[PDB]
Short mmCIF file of C-alpha atoms in Angstrom, two decimals:
data_model
loop_
_atom_site.label_atom_id
_atom_site.label_comp_id
_atom_site.label_asym_id
_atom_site.label_seq_id
_atom_site.Cartn_x
_atom_site.Cartn_y
_atom_site.Cartn_z
CA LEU A 9 70.27 109.49 103.30
CA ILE A 10 72.01 108.00 100.40
CA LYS A 11 70.03 108.82 97.33
CA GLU A 12 70.32 107.51 93.76
CA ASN A 13 71.91 110.61 92.62
CA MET A 14 74.22 112.08 95.25
CA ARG A 15 76.52 115.08 94.97
CA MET A 16 79.95 115.41 96.65
CA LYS A 17 82.39 118.18 97.46
CA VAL A 18 85.94 117.90 98.37
CA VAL A 19 88.97 119.65 99.74
CA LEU A 20 92.43 118.08 99.22
CA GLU A 21 95.58 119.54 100.53
CA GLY A 22 99.03 118.88 101.53
CA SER A 23 102.49 118.58 99.98
CA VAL A 24 104.44 116.32 97.68
CA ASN A 25 108.32 116.53 97.81
CA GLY A 26 107.79 119.72 99.87
CA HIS A 27 105.57 121.42 97.36
CA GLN A 28 102.38 122.76 99.08
CA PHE A 29 99.07 122.82 97.24
CA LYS A 30 95.25 122.83 97.70
CA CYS A 31 92.62 121.39 95.30
CA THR A 32 88.85 121.63 95.39
CA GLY A 33 86.45 119.32 93.71
CA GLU A 34 82.71 118.87 93.14
CA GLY A 35 80.68 116.18 91.32
CA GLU A 36 77.97 113.73 91.47
CA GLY A 37 77.21 110.04 90.85
CA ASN A 38 74.87 107.13 91.36
CA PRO A 39 75.99 105.42 94.47
CA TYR A 40 74.12 102.24 94.01
CA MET A 41 75.44 101.88 90.35
CA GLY A 42 78.94 102.51 91.52
CA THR A 43 79.60 105.59 89.07
CA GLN A 44 80.68 109.05 89.90
CA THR A 45 82.39 111.95 88.10
CA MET A 46 84.30 114.76 89.86
CA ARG A 47 85.48 118.22 88.55
CA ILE A 48 88.69 119.23 90.18
CA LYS A 49 90.62 122.57 90.38
CA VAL A 50 94.18 123.24 91.78
CA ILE A 51 93.41 126.44 93.63
CA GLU A 52 96.86 126.94 95.51
CA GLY A 53 100.27 125.82 94.50
CA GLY A 54 99.57 125.24 90.87
CA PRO A 55 100.80 124.34 88.39
CA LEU A 56 101.88 121.22 90.50
CA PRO A 57 105.40 120.01 89.69
CA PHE A 58 104.28 116.30 89.92
CA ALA A 59 101.73 114.13 88.11
CA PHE A 60 98.18 114.68 89.01
CA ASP A 61 97.63 110.97 88.68
CA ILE A 62 99.22 110.50 92.31
CA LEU A 63 96.23 112.29 93.79
CA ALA A 64 93.56 110.94 91.68
CA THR A 65 92.85 108.15 93.99
CA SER A 66 92.46 110.52 96.93
CA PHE A 67 89.49 112.24 95.61
CA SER A 69 84.97 108.33 97.25
CA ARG A 70 83.91 105.02 98.69
CA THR A 71 80.03 105.56 99.04
CA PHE A 72 79.93 105.14 95.27
CA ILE A 73 80.45 101.44 95.04
CA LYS A 74 77.89 98.84 93.54
CA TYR A 75 77.33 96.22 96.10
CA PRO A 76 75.58 92.84 95.27
CA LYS A 77 73.10 91.09 97.54
CA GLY A 78 75.29 88.89 99.75
CA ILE A 79 77.88 91.67 100.57
CA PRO A 80 76.88 94.36 103.09
CA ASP A 81 77.93 97.75 102.15
CA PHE A 82 79.90 99.17 104.97
CA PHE A 83 80.26 102.65 103.56
CA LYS A 84 76.55 103.25 103.01
CA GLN A 85 75.69 101.96 106.31
CA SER A 86 77.96 104.50 108.02
CA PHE A 87 75.72 107.37 107.51
CA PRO A 88 74.67 109.89 108.62
CA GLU A 89 77.88 109.93 110.72
CA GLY A 90 80.19 109.01 107.75
CA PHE A 91 83.58 107.41 107.86
CA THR A 92 87.23 107.93 107.63
CA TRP A 93 90.09 106.38 105.68
CA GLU A 94 93.80 106.40 106.21
CA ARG A 95 96.15 105.05 103.47
CA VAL A 96 99.90 104.65 102.96
CA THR A 97 100.73 104.32 99.32
CA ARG A 98 104.31 102.98 98.35
CA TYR A 99 105.52 103.33 94.80
CA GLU A 100 108.18 101.03 93.44
CA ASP A 101 110.55 103.95 92.99
CA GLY A 102 110.59 104.86 96.56
CA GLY A 103 107.75 107.53 96.60
CA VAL A 104 105.66 107.31 99.70
CA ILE A 105 102.30 109.21 99.98
CA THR A 106 100.19 109.22 103.25
CA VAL A 107 96.63 110.41 103.29
CA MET A 108 94.03 110.99 105.86
CA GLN A 109 90.50 111.50 104.77
CA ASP A 110 87.24 112.26 106.49
CA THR A 111 83.89 111.72 104.75
CA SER A 112 80.78 113.59 106.11
CA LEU A 113 77.27 114.09 105.13
CA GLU A 114 76.35 117.77 105.25
CA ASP A 115 73.00 119.35 104.06
CA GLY A 116 72.48 116.17 102.05
CA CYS A 117 75.82 116.51 100.28
CA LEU A 118 78.88 114.31 100.59
CA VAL A 119 81.79 116.31 101.96
CA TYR A 120 85.37 115.05 102.00
CA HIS A 121 88.53 116.45 103.41
CA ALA A 122 91.90 114.74 102.47
CA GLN A 123 95.13 115.83 103.93
CA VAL A 124 98.11 114.34 101.91
CA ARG A 125 101.95 114.08 102.38
CA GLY A 126 104.14 112.62 99.81
CA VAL A 127 107.93 112.32 100.00
CA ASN A 128 110.73 110.55 98.49
CA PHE A 129 109.80 110.75 94.79
CA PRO A 130 112.83 110.66 92.55
CA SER A 131 113.38 114.08 90.98
CA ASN A 132 113.73 112.69 87.41
CA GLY A 133 111.20 109.94 87.88
CA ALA A 134 107.83 109.54 85.97
CA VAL A 135 105.84 111.23 88.86
CA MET A 136 107.97 114.41 89.18
CA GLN A 137 108.54 114.87 85.58
CA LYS A 138 104.92 114.35 84.74
CA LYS A 139 105.44 111.40 82.39
CA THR A 140 102.35 109.38 83.57
CA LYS A 141 99.23 108.17 81.58
CA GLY A 142 96.60 107.19 84.22
CA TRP A 143 95.86 104.02 86.11
CA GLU A 144 95.22 100.52 84.91
CA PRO A 145 91.90 98.93 86.24
CA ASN A 146 92.42 97.24 89.45
CA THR A 147 90.95 95.03 92.15
CA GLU A 148 91.12 95.98 95.86
CA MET A 149 90.81 93.32 98.47
CA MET A 150 88.55 94.28 101.40
CA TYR A 151 88.91 92.49 104.80
CA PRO A 152 86.82 92.97 107.95
CA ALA A 153 89.04 94.08 110.79
CA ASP A 154 87.68 94.88 114.28
CA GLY A 155 84.43 96.59 113.06
CA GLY A 156 86.20 98.37 110.20
CA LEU A 157 87.75 97.39 106.94
CA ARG A 158 91.21 97.02 105.64
CA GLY A 159 91.58 97.40 101.91
CA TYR A 160 94.72 96.12 100.11
CA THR A 161 95.50 97.29 96.59
CA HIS A 162 98.35 96.60 94.05
CA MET A 163 97.92 99.28 91.18
CA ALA A 164 99.83 99.99 88.04
CA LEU A 165 100.39 103.58 86.92
CA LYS A 166 100.94 103.77 83.14
CA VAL A 167 104.08 105.83 82.05
CA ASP A 168 105.44 107.18 78.90
CA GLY A 169 107.21 104.56 76.98
CA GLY A 170 104.44 102.01 77.70
CA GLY A 171 105.79 100.71 81.00
CA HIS A 172 104.07 100.78 84.45
CA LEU A 173 105.03 102.02 87.88
CA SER A 174 103.61 99.72 90.57
CA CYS A 175 102.39 100.89 93.90
CA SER A 176 100.69 99.22 96.75
CA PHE A 177 98.69 100.47 99.58
CA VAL A 178 96.76 99.46 102.54
CA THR A 179 93.78 101.48 103.54
CA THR A 180 92.19 101.47 107.04
CA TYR A 181 88.32 102.29 106.74
CA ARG A 182 86.90 103.37 110.09
CA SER A 183 83.16 104.13 110.69
CA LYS A 184 82.18 107.07 112.80
CA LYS A 185 78.84 105.53 113.33
CA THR A 186 78.61 104.56 117.14
CA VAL A 187 74.69 104.87 117.30
CA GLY A 188 73.18 101.95 115.32
CA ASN A 189 75.25 99.03 114.16
CA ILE A 190 76.70 98.28 110.81
CA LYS A 191 76.11 94.76 109.52
CA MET A 192 79.73 93.77 108.52
CA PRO A 193 80.74 92.18 105.20
CA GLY A 194 82.76 89.19 104.72
CA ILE A 195 85.92 89.41 102.67
CA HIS A 196 85.35 90.66 99.29
CA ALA A 197 86.90 92.35 96.31
CA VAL A 198 86.19 95.81 94.72
CA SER A 199 86.99 96.27 90.85
CA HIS A 200 87.73 99.83 90.00
CA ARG A 201 88.26 101.76 86.67
CA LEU A 202 89.24 105.37 87.06
CA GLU A 203 89.34 107.38 83.88
CA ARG A 204 90.52 110.83 83.19
CA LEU A 205 87.83 112.66 81.11
CA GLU A 206 89.39 116.06 80.64
CA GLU A 207 92.35 117.99 81.58
CA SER A 208 93.83 121.42 80.96
CA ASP A 209 97.47 121.83 79.76
CA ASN A 210 99.20 121.96 83.16
CA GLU A 211 96.67 119.70 85.00
CA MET A 212 95.23 122.56 86.88
CA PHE A 213 91.77 121.51 85.82
CA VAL A 214 90.88 117.81 85.69
CA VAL A 215 87.53 115.84 85.25
CA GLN A 216 87.58 112.19 86.28
CA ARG A 217 85.13 109.34 86.40
CA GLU A 218 85.14 106.14 88.47
CA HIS A 219 83.21 102.87 88.07
CA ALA A 220 83.52 100.57 91.23
CA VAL A 221 81.77 97.22 91.80
CA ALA A 222 82.08 94.83 94.69
CA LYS A 223 82.37 91.07 94.14
CA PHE A 224 83.00 87.93 95.81
CA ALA A 225 86.74 87.06 96.23
CA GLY A 226 87.12 83.33 95.11
CA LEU A 227 89.62 81.25 97.12
CA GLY A 228 91.05 84.42 98.65
CA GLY A 229 87.62 84.99 100.08
CA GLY A 230 88.13 82.12 102.52
#
């Protein structure tokens, strides 16, 4: 079901500080190598009056490299797929809630994300488009009643060389209820998300991600 080269398509829509928009993306990657690239268009509501960086982490968990010794929750969830629900809090008060469905349709991964952001300061780096991409990070993953909870502290680079911190907790839930998933233990996922291309107003973006699971040291228990 999950081949060495897999394509994905995504619809992402919602609002940030009351501004409605819709984006569509399509890409491909190597799910067992933890690599993927996506080409994204803002098709409604552009140009967005906020940094695209705040959406970039909402566009793919099937594409994580898992070593022997750590079961891959996401790959095992197919054909039914899985969902994820996330609340992201930024240090300047911005809050983004995202609900995402992941499905496998005609051999393609198909994502739908609904996003609602509020409370971003009007003259902050996000709403003034003064961001410069995400620093690499490590997400902790914990088993929780047959799903996973992911916990992340991320740093968004800003003009002036500072960072805006954010944290989030993601609930990952499998839609497979025929067949069982072999649950992992506590582990960590290292991510690096890079912007490859962008147009002037960010209405076209290409981004690539590398994600590799690892054991979590003392925090692994």
